[PDB]
Amino acid sequence: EVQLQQSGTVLARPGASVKMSCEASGYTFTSYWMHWLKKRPGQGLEWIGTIYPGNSDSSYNQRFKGKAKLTAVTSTSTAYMELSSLTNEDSAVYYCTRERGLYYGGRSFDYWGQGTTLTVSSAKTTPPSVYPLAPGSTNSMVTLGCLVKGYFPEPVTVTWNSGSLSSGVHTFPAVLESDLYTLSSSVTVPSSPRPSETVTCNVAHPASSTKVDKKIVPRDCG
């Protein structure tokens, strides 16, 4: 019905500026107010400002005054937000949404974008190091994994034996360490089929155009 389509994930350096867009569709863009919101992980949704396409009338939060500039292009029915003097606290997911009075007096937002993720860091694109995780020196099942370390930016993709093992697998969300991302993935198999047939974790990091395959092999001593 009323579709809004926001821009893809964006990487930016501190001190830099970014410009994200929201394509409106399914209605008359010049009639309803568009609103921009900022979502940080631990915290609630925060209101930045709003713009009325057609007359370009705007209203801003005092906190985002000088930081966020809002604008609208009627021809393409697209709204834009520009963020200046970027910091790490600006890293978040930004939402574009439409305001409409569903009741006389009230303010609600009836249709939303899918969100745009902004990542601010001084980190440069760095490939991941992939390390096999085999147990030391036994039950019916055995757990393996591979640690993917020191890569940037997100995302990275992990599979096992080219996807032939979709089960007993847990791939964990990355965490940030020294401006570099890190995650690990686990895979569980019966202990019957393993050192005997191959188990391999496959890591992909498109940003650096690298694909790596680490076959998990038991560590013996000597």
Partner: protein, 214 residues
């Protein structure tokens, strides 16, 4: 500045059960209150406006109530797709303000974590670093604590944890705890232990290894 708070960050319930999410305002917002649903994919949908008014296209199992400073959202017969983050916002005054949200999760039988520990790879040691990884897989409920112990002393630095969202299939949680050190620090100690304590057992789950050992 009219701050909307949702005391409960996470809420557990079963399918078919009636669940109620609460929202509170710092001042009277005069029944101008709206509820939203945010699924994991990240999409947002408006559910209820003016506290009790159901938006077009929304199932009737959704209901809303409240007045003054307190408001509540109700789901009569919980379905699997009703698993999401629910948050409120006030439409009485500017700026518009939202609640932190209430995450809805599914309820199941308590299950102990399957714990596995992994010494650093020989390949990582060539780089100069040492990461000891501990997997805690498929347990419920989600609340859990991991303890890193080296020999006799506890270690809180270099430990990074990561939690999965609730599995949409077996309704369990999994977690990885990773202790990161440098080669020298790793080689100057012997016993490395990963202890997990969970509702399912009074005794901690202990997995360890010794670097001197093969």
């Amino acid at each position: 500045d009219i701050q909307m708070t949702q005391t409960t960050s996470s809420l557990s319930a079963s399918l078919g059960d009636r669940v109620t999410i609460s929202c509170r305002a710092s001042q009277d917002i005069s029944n101008y209150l709206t509820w939203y649903q945010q699924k994991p994919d990240g999409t947002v949908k408006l559910l209820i406006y003016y506290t009790s008014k159901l938006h077009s296209g929304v199932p009737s199992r959704f209901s809303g109530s409240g007045s003054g400073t307190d408001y509540s959202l109700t789901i009569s017969n919980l379905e699997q797709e009703d698993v999401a983050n629910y948050f409120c916002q006030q439409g009485n005054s500017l700026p518009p303000t939202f609640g932190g949200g209430t995450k809805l999760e599914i309820k199941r039988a308590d299950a102990a974590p399957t714990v596995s520990i992994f010494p650093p790879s020989s390949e990582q040691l060539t780089s100069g670093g040492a990461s000891v990884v501990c997997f805690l897989n498929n347990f419920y409920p989600k609340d859990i604590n991991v303890k890193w112990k080296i020999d006799g002393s506890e270690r809180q630095n270099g430990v990074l944890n990561s939690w999965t969202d609730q599995d949409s299939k077996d309704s369990t949680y999994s977690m990885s705890s990773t202790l990161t050190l440098t080669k020298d620090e790793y080689e100057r100690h012997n016993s490395y232990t990963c202890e997990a304590t969970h509702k399912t057992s009074t005794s901690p789950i202990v997995k360890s290894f010794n670097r001197n050992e093969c």
